[PDB]
Design a protein around this ligand. Structure first.
Ligand SMILES: Nc1nc2c(ncn2[C@@H]2O[C@H](COP(=O)(O)OP(=O)(O)O)[C@@H](O)[C@H]2O)c(=O)[nH]1
Length: 387
């Protein structure tokens, strides 16, 4: 019963804590080497290069924890106008957050992120005032209007997801990149009353140029309009499936035809939205029906989406920082070894002996500490990054 998204938020809390401990350690470590380097009583027990390295790791690590804290999952929706992109987003949020017409109405992107506040509001580029919501939106060289919405009202925003609507793929496809390469999942919202178009196809090819292997979903929306016809429904679906498959598996072969079953859904976002928005009254009603089978299909989509995006986003957003921290800790271990050795070797003795043995001792506590943080990084990769 617990959202797969929890995985990412859990990971973010873990990696955050580690890089705090880690920055704390390298700072302490850096003061030491500096102390030892600058000591006049000492002859090269620690070098200036030793110091500079440490100071560099300190100034680095400091900046990594900053960017970690600002990291979220991002899903991006595309579709011809009136395919139902905005409805899908609203259905996932359980409320009419985005109004029908956007971003055809506005001709720009609309992100939806959570706020810790309790009032919704808008924010544009190069400005930090909080315009009142959509109220002032039909108004608001690319273009982005960020919608904030109370975390207390949507689970997905509470759990670090950001949702983006495009203006519909009803030109161009180079200026969007300004919004996209952050994205962990791209969703093609298709109109099931009509067929997969090339203008739709064409935009995902450019994503599949640039991004290495992007996670792509296809939602065949408006599925209600082909309903109530059990034998018609099933032969129609087969034809949409086969063209949807042919676009994922072969023309963008970014998935094989068995993993692709878990990438393609038939869905009625309007049905799901109405059903969800009604939870203030305790059930009436839907459009054709059919309607329980559709609503389950949307829920299976949600669950798979959330498995996919959480796991993908942890890899591409946390793994390399972890690798970088392993290499950092290894170089620091080396530097303690180097100081410790230089110190039993006298150089790189009355009571000088006793200053040196204290230096040896500090370096070993530091090295031992590098080793705990190493252990915490492996424990991290074990829980959040296997295999
Ligand atoms: N019958 C039906 N209508 C839908 C569905 N999804 C959206 N709509 C309707 O289609 C129109 C436009 O949908 P919208 O989400 O605003 O399209 P967008 O421009 O891609 O954002 C509105 O009348 C919606 O209520 C659906 O699954 N079934």
């Amino acid at each position: 019963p617990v959202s797969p998204l929890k995985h990412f938020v859990l990971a973010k809390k873990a990696i955050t804590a580690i890089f705090d401990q880690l920055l704390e350690f390298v700072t302490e470590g850096s003061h030491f080497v500096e102390a030892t380097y600058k000591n006049p009583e000492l002859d090269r027990i620690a070098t200036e290069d030793d110091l500079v390295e440490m100071q560099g790791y300190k100034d680095k690590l400091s900046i990594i924890g900053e960017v970690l804290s600002r990291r979220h999952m991002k899903v991006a929706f595309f579709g011809r106008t009136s395919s139902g992109a905005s409805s899908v987003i609203n259905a996932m949020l359980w409320d009419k957050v985005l109004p029908s017409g956007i971003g055809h109405i506005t001709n720009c992107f609309l992100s939806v992120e959570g706020t810790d506040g309790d009032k919704a509001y808008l924010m544009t580029e190069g400005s930090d005032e909080k315009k009142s919501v959509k109220t002032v939106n039909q108004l608001a060289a690319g273009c982005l209007v960020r919608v904030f919405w109370p975390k207390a009202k949507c689970a997905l925003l509470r759990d670090d997801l950001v949702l983006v609507d495009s203006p519909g793929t009803d030109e161009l496809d180079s200026w969007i990149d300004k919004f996209c390469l952050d994205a962990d999942v791209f969703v093609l919202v298709a109109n099931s009353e009509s067929t997969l178009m090339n203008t739709e196809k064409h935009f995902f090819h450019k994503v599949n140029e640039r991004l290495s292997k992007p996670n792509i979903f296809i939602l065949n929306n408006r599925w209600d309009a082909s309903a109530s016809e059990p034998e018609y429904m099933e032969d129609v679906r087969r034809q949409h499936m086969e063209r949807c498959l042919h676009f994922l598996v072969e023309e963008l072969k970014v998935v094989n035809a068995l993993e692709a079953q878990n990438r393609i859904f038939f869905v009625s976002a309007k049905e799901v939205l109405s059903a969800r928005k009604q939870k203030a009254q305790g059930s009436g009603v839907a459009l054709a029906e059919g309607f329980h089978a559709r609503l389950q299909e949307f829920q299976n989509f949600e669950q798979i989406f959330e498995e996919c995006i959480s796991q993908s986003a942890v890899k591409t957003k946390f793994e390399q920082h972890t690798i970088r921290a392993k290499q950092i800790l290894a170089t620091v271990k080396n530097i303690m070894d180097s100081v410790n050795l230089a110190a039993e070797d006298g150089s790189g003795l009355p009571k000088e002996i006793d200053q040196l043995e204290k230096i040896q001792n500090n370096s070993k506590l530091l090295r031992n500490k590098a080793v705990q943080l190493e252990n915490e990084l492996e424990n991290f990769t074990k829980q959040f990054l296997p295999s």
